[PDB]
Design an enzyme around this catalytic site. Structure first.
Site, PDB file in Angstrom:
ATOM      1  N   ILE B  11       5.368   1.995  -6.693  1.00 12.47           N
ATOM      2  CA  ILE B  11       5.697   0.519  -7.103  1.00 12.47           C
ATOM      3  C   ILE B  11       4.410  -0.170  -7.364  1.00 12.47           C
ATOM      4  CG2 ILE B  11       6.280  -1.559  -5.760  1.00 12.47           C
ATOM      5  CD1 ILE B  11       8.353   1.638  -6.094  1.00 12.47           C
ATOM      6  N   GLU B  13       0.012  -0.986  -5.671  1.00 12.37           N
ATOM      7  CA  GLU B  13      -0.865  -1.155  -4.714  1.00 12.37           C
ATOM      8  C   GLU B  13      -1.736  -2.211  -4.539  1.00 12.37           C
ATOM      9  OE1 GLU B  13      -4.120   1.565  -4.779  1.00 12.37           O
ATOM     10  OE2 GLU B  13      -4.192   1.398  -7.090  1.00 12.37           O
ATOM     11  N   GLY B  14      -1.734  -2.421  -3.271  1.00 19.50           N
ATOM     12  CA  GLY B  14      -2.608  -3.642  -2.890  1.00 19.50           C
ATOM     13  C   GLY B  14      -2.968  -3.843  -1.397  1.00 19.50           C
ATOM     14  N   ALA B  15      -3.058  -4.765  -0.669  1.00 13.88           N
ATOM     15  CA  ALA B  15      -3.683  -4.920   0.662  1.00 13.88           C
ATOM     16  C   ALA B  15      -3.216  -4.090   1.453  1.00 13.88           C
ATOM     17  CB  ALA B  15      -3.523  -6.267   0.935  1.00 13.88           C
ATOM     18  N   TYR B  16      -2.154  -3.395   1.291  1.00 12.16           N
ATOM     19  CA  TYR B  16      -1.555  -2.380   2.334  1.00 12.16           C
ATOM     20  C   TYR B  16      -1.355  -0.784   2.159  1.00 12.16           C
ATOM     21  CZ  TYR B  16      -0.524  -6.671   4.701  1.00 12.16           C
ATOM     22  OH  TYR B  16      -0.568  -7.883   5.367  1.00 12.16           O
ATOM     23  N   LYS B  18      -0.887   1.946  -1.034  1.00 14.99           N
ATOM     24  CA  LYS B  18       0.114   2.248  -2.067  1.00 14.99           C
ATOM     25  C   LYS B  18       1.435   2.182  -1.446  1.00 14.99           C
ATOM     26  CE  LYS B  18      -2.571   4.895  -5.247  1.00 14.99           C
ATOM     27  NZ  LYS B  18      -2.668   6.404  -6.003  1.00 14.99           N
ATOM     28  N   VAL B  19       2.438   1.431  -2.314  1.00 14.64           N
ATOM     29  CA  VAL B  19       3.790   1.363  -2.149  1.00 14.64           C
ATOM     30  C   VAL B  19       4.656   2.228  -2.926  1.00 14.64           C
ATOM     31  CG1 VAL B  19       5.311  -0.505  -1.838  1.00 14.64           C
ATOM     32  CG2 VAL B  19       3.403  -1.143  -1.876  1.00 14.64           C
ATOM     33  N   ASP B 137       1.459 -15.017   3.774  1.00 14.01           N
ATOM     34  CA  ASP B 137       1.690 -14.848   2.421  1.00 14.01           C
ATOM     35  C   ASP B 137       3.162 -14.926   2.105  1.00 14.01           C
ATOM     36  OD1 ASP B 137       0.899 -13.916  -0.392  1.00 14.01           O
ATOM     37  OD2 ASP B 137       1.326 -12.087   0.338  1.00 14.01           O
TER      38      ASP B 137
END
EC number: 2.7.11.22
Lengths: 155, 293, 233
Positions: B11, B13-16, B18-19, B137
């Site tokens: 989906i 990738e960001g602060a946590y 990859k999704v 957020d």
């Protein structure tokens, strides 16, 4: 390819739409063996409509034996399930355990999805899956009584 | 796990980390969301925050609040010493507030649905605060909406970029929900989230965001244009951008923008959209507001 | 009504962190209740000594005893295991997380820094990163407040009750009780009637929503347990 699938997955209509202008193959599988229509953001009927409109084949099932209409039906996203039919998706396509979208909708309690299938689709009701069960049976076996009633008040 | 959960799509990738979107092979291949991080081993062992964060998630899960996304599992895959592949498995809802709002027919979202969603939103939000957790957020893409019409608060750590047409500038959409204390780099306390609830609340009516700033100084202004310049007493002390930095701002009637809202809705909305964080309503209070009867 | 509602909910979660003394001569095999009481007091030492909050010990003991509920731990490694709990517990509760080297040291250097680290990874895996728990020390404040009405004193007694609580926890029997119970029982044993409005037990019992007899039993039990505490190696 992969970017189309991911755009479908995160439901980036914008990005998905560029990719679909480059005469790419809507039916190509990503590195997980899945196609953009299959992994798409189910709550977004427009993602589906555009892919379908570019040749995506609705009846393709993945390694695990599912088609989009199965997962949409299981999530209760009727509009998406409906735009899928709108593009000729087979209402009776069974998963690998002999289930129909109807079974899964019934099993999950999605009454307005059972409602639709029963009264407006060629959904073969009596169909029994590999365990011999029926959509209505599963509703019964899962407590979706509200669903059971309506279902039998009709079939 | 990692043989029970089968990825199907990344989906983002960001602060946590990859999704992904994956199938839960032990529950009929139902879709489930995964977050994958590569945790760095120290000479101190496992990183504090990694431990703390997973600790809190696991712990809040105990309570099983209906308005927070379920955390089904935690899988670990130790590579070498220096690396461990950490994976969190969550319930997945293939629809967020944005995909819903901008899909409703023209009349708009039923006023009764706006209330119901809004109540649930504050329900799950009150749960987090009461256990000393601040979201920080709250953006509509972090608000999950089941086909059933149920609200489930998420936190994917994924940023979305919006590009301004004429300006040829861009912003990360979260900026549009960021509370003033935060923009002014002043306090970053719990009320912070209420300001966003207020923005989201207003968006449910508009089906378009309320304050679309192009920077943080621009955002601040977009805000004061509507709510009006706060008084000396309500501006933060010792901050880089003084009250004087923004010329006279009247205070337009909120309904001028949150079109078709009602009298009590307007009241709640402005109690969330209150500049001074200390005078901003609380999730618990809002919850008890006569809007919800 | 912020306080009162969190309390009520914490109570439902509560049972989820219950442990059991029954493990030793059976599922454990190699370990005995007394060896645990030793390891436990040593842990207690390292803590209140290396300047750690009571919470750290309370939690470190909960992890150790929840761990012993699913993993058979050898005699040779019991200690190192108790250490990993100490490490993780302070990483979760102290502003001053104790260091690996610091632990390996107090451990007579019996185990390697790597080895302690490998036990931390191990501990996290068996417990599946579920390292937080409602503790009896976590409840003492809210209760201590409903008793010592005002705010004055609330800090002397809080720190006092919690120190008793940790001592009672070195005894594995205590771990079979709800955080709320252990917590009230502790208050009941220390707080004098002169610093309280208007009985103490029927008052706490009323708050916990339990029977007066149940709370008394807990007092009685915990009283015994605390008495046994003795830091003499």
């Amino acid at each position: 390819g992969n970017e189309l699938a991911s755009a479908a997955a995160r439901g980036d209509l914008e990005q998905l739409t560029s990719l679909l202008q480059n005469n790419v193959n809507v039916n190509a599988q990503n590195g997980f063996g899945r196609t953009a229509l299959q992994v798409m953001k189910l709550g977004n009927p427009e993602i589906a409509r555009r892919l379908l409109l570019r040749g995506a084949n609705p009846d393709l099932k993945d390694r695990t034996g599912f088609a989009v209409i199965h997962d949409a039906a299981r999530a209760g996203f009727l509009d998406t399930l409906q735009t899928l039919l709108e593009f000729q998706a087979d209402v009776n396509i069974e998963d690998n355990e002999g289930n129909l979208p109807l079974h899964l909708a019934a099993k999950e309690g999605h009454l307005r999805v059972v409602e639709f299938l029963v009264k407006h689709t060629a959904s073969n009701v009596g169909h029994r899956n590999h365990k011999g069960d029926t959509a209505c049976d599963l509703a019964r076996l899962y407590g979706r009584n509200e669903v059971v009633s309506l279902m039998q008040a009709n079939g | 796990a990692d043989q029970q959960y089968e990825c199907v799509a990344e989906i983002g990738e960001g602060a946590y980390g990859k999704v992904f979107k994956a199938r839960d092979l032990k529950n009929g291949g139902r879709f489930v969301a995964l977050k994958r991080v590569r945790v760095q081993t120290g000479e101190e062992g496992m990183p504090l925050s990694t431990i703390r964060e997973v600790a809190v998630l696991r712990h809040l899960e105990t309570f099983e609040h209906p308005n927070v996304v379920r955390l089904f599992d935690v899988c670990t895959v130790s590579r070498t010493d220096r690396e461990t592949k950490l994976t969190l498995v969550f319930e997945h809802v293939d629809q967020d507030l944005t995909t819903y709002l901008d899909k409703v027919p023209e009349p708009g979202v039923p006023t009764e649905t706006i209330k119901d969603m809004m109540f649930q939103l504050l329900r799950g939000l009150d749960f987090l605060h009461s256990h000393r957790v601040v979201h920080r957020d709250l953006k509509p893409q972090n608000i999950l909406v089941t086909s059933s019409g149920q609200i489930k608060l998420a936190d994917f750590g994924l940023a979305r970029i919006y590009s301004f047409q004429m300006a040829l500038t861009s912003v990360v959409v979260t900026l549009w929900y960021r509370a003033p204390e935060v923009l002014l780099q002043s306090s970053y306390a719990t009320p912070v989230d209420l300001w966003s609830v207020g923005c989201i609340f207003a968006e449910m009516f508009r089906r378009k965001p309320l304050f679309r700033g192009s920077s943080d100084v621009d955002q601040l202004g977009k805000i004061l244009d509507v709510i009006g310049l706060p008084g000396e007493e309500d501006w933060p002390r010792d901050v880089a951008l003084p009250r004087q930095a923004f010329h006279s701002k009247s205070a337009q009637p909120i309904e001028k923008f949150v079109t078709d809202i009602d009298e009590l809705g307007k009241d709640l909305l402005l109690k969330c959209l209150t500049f001074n964080p200390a005078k901003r309503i609380s999730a618990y209070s809002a919850l008890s507001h006569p809007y919800f009867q | 009504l912020c306080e009162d509602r969190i309390f009520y909910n914490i109570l439902e979660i509560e049972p989820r962190f219950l442990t059991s003394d029954s493990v030793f001569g059976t599922f454990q095999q190699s370990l005995t209740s007394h060896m645990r009481k030793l390891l436990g007091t040593w842990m207690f030492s390292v803590c209140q000594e290396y300047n750690l909050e009571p919470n750290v010990v309370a939690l470190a003991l909960n992890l150790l005893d929840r761990l012993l509920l699913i993993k058979q731990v050898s005699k040779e490694h019991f200690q190192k295991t108790g250490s990993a709990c100490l490490l993780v517990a302070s990483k979760l509760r102290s502003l001053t997380p104790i260091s690996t080297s610091s632990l390996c040291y107090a451990a007579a250097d019996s185990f390697s820094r790597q080895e302690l680290i490998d036990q931390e990874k191990e501990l996290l895996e068996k417990l599946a990163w579920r390292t937080e728990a409602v503790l009896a020390t976590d409840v003492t404040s809210f209760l201590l407040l409903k008793l010592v009405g005002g705010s004055q004193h609330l800090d002397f007694w809080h720190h006092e009750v919690n120190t008793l609580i940790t001592k009672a926890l070195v005894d594995p029997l205590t771990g079979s009780l709800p955080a709320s119970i252990i917590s009230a029982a502790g208050c009941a044993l220390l707080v004098p009637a002169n610093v309280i409005p208007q009985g103490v037990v029927p008052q706490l019992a009323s708050i916990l929503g339990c029977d007066v007899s149940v709370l008394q039993a807990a007092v009685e039990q915990i009283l015994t347990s605390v008495s046994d505490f003795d830091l003499r190696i």
